[PDB]
Amino acid sequence: IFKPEELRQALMPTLEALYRQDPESLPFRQPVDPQLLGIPDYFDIVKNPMDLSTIKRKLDTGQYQEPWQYVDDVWLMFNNAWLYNRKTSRVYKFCSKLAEVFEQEIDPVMQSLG
Ligand SMILES: CC(=O)Nc1cc(NC(=O)c2ccco2)cc(C(=O)Nc2cccc3nnc(C)cc23)c1
């Protein structure tokens, strides 16, 4: 019911808005590498990692048939971050900032969709 190119053009601005957040999006632009980051328990806690680069691939290549599937992956990324990091930590605080930006942008777009 959703033309993949129309869904892509409708949702991509909201993804670009997260990328644009600097420094807040820096921890989210690529999949968490627990070896490089010295957090070897990460994958034990986070069973379904998600990040901006994986969402972009799926949005670019028509792997979201419905808008809610895009939104679910965005919130998966946020929930992983809030789950793994302490509420006072950098990554936790950057996550809440990104969730604020995302919520403001997505609701009009979801309204204009469906
Ligand atoms: C690795 C990489 O490629 N990029 C990168 C860049 C920056 N840089 C700034 O944050 C910055 C620089 C200047 C101002 O701010 C920070 C991090 C980072 O802290 N990652 C994480 C550590 C621990 C737990 C995490 N849990 N979940 C997530 C999603 C990410 C985590 C990673």
Structural overview:
The PDB classes it as transferase. Keywords: Inhibitor, Complex, crebbp, Bromodomain, transferase. The assembly is monomeric. Crystal structure of CREBBP bromodomain complexed with LA36. The chain has six helices and no strands. The protein has helices spanning 4-20, 34-37, 42-45, 52-60, 67-84, 90-111. The protein is globular. The structure holds the ligand CC(=O)Nc1cc(NC(=O)c2ccco2)cc(C(=O)Nc2cccc3nnc(C)cc23)c1. The site of the ligand CC(=O)Nc1cc(NC(=O)c2ccco2)cc(C(=O)Nc2cccc3nnc(C)cc23)c1 has 14 residues, from α2, α5 and α6. Ligand LU5 binds next to α2, α5 and α6.
Give the helix/strand layout.
Elements: H1 4-20, H2 34-37, H3 42-45, H4 52-60, H5 67-84, H6 90-111
Bound molecules: the ligand CC(=O)Nc1cc(NC(=O)c2ccco2)cc(C(=O)Nc2cccc3nnc(C)cc23)c1.
Domain Bromo: 2-109
Subcellular location: Cytoplasm; Nucleus
Protein name: CREB-binding protein
